[PDB]
Amino acid sequence: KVFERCELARTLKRLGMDGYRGISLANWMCLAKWESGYNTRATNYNAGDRSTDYGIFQINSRYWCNDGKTPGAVNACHLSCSALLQDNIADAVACAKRVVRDPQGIRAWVAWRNRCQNRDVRQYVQGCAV
Ligand code: NA
């Protein structure tokens, strides 16, 4: 599914993401926007290492989830990557929480560093009542 802006904002907030590891709701929104356009079914396959990024947060199969088809992969969130392509984003949020608990934090996502880090992102939650 493709979430509407404020719909996703409310959902992420309900799922405890606002301020998680010091990351504002607006930042999580900015990450989802640039990664998948709020599309839970988004997948990005990389032929170079045969890994695939899954879901709204575009979580990579070489390290975070298992898809049974990525060479030399690990599964840090202990979850199947298909659970990251569901309309119910509870699993995706839980795994995103895990990712950011590593040293680099939210800087793990190159898109976030390029389009969100140090920039105004207040627009993402404008008029959402969150
Ligand atoms: Na994996």
UniProtKB/Swiss-Prot annotation:
It is an enzyme of class 3 (hydrolase). It catalyses: Hydrolysis of (1->4)-beta-linkages between N-acetylmuramic acid and N-acetyl-D-glucosamine residues in a peptidoglycan and between N-acetyl-D-glucosamine residues in chitodextrins. GO terms for molecular function: identical protein binding; lysozyme activity. GO terms for cellular component: azurophil granule lumen; extracellular exosome; extracellular region; extracellular space; specific granule lumen; tertiary granule lumen. It is found in: Secreted. Keywords: Amyloid, Amyloidosis, Antimicrobial, Bacteriolytic enzyme, Disease variant, Disulfide bond, Glycosidase, Hydrolase, Secreted, Signal. Its main location: secreted. InterPro entries: Glyco_hydro_22, Glyco_hydro_22_CS, Glyco_hydro_22_lys, Lysozyme-like_dom_sf. Pfam families: Lys. The keyword Signal applies. Disulfide bonds join C6-C128, C30-C116, C65-C81, C77-C95. It comes from the Eukaryota. The active site is at E35, D53. Residues 1-130 form the C-type lysozyme domain. Lysozyme C is capable of both hydrolysis and transglycosylation; it also shows a slight esterase activity. It acts rapidly on both peptide-substituted and unsubstituted peptidoglycan, and slowly on chitin oligosaccharides. Lysozymes have primarily a bacteriolytic function; those in tissues and body fluids are associated with the monocyte-macrophage system and enhance the activity of immunoagents. Monomer. It is linked to Amyloidosis, hereditary systemic 5: A form of hereditary systemic amyloidosis, a disorder characterized by amyloid deposition in multiple tissues resulting in a wide clinical spectrum. AMYLD5 primarily affects the viscera, and the predominant clinical features are renal dysfunction of varying severity, and intra-abdominal bleeding. Inheritance is autosomal dominant. PANTHER family: LYSOZYME C. This is Lysozyme C. The lineage of its organism: Eukaryota, Metazoa, Chordata, Craniata, Vertebrata. The gene is LYZ.
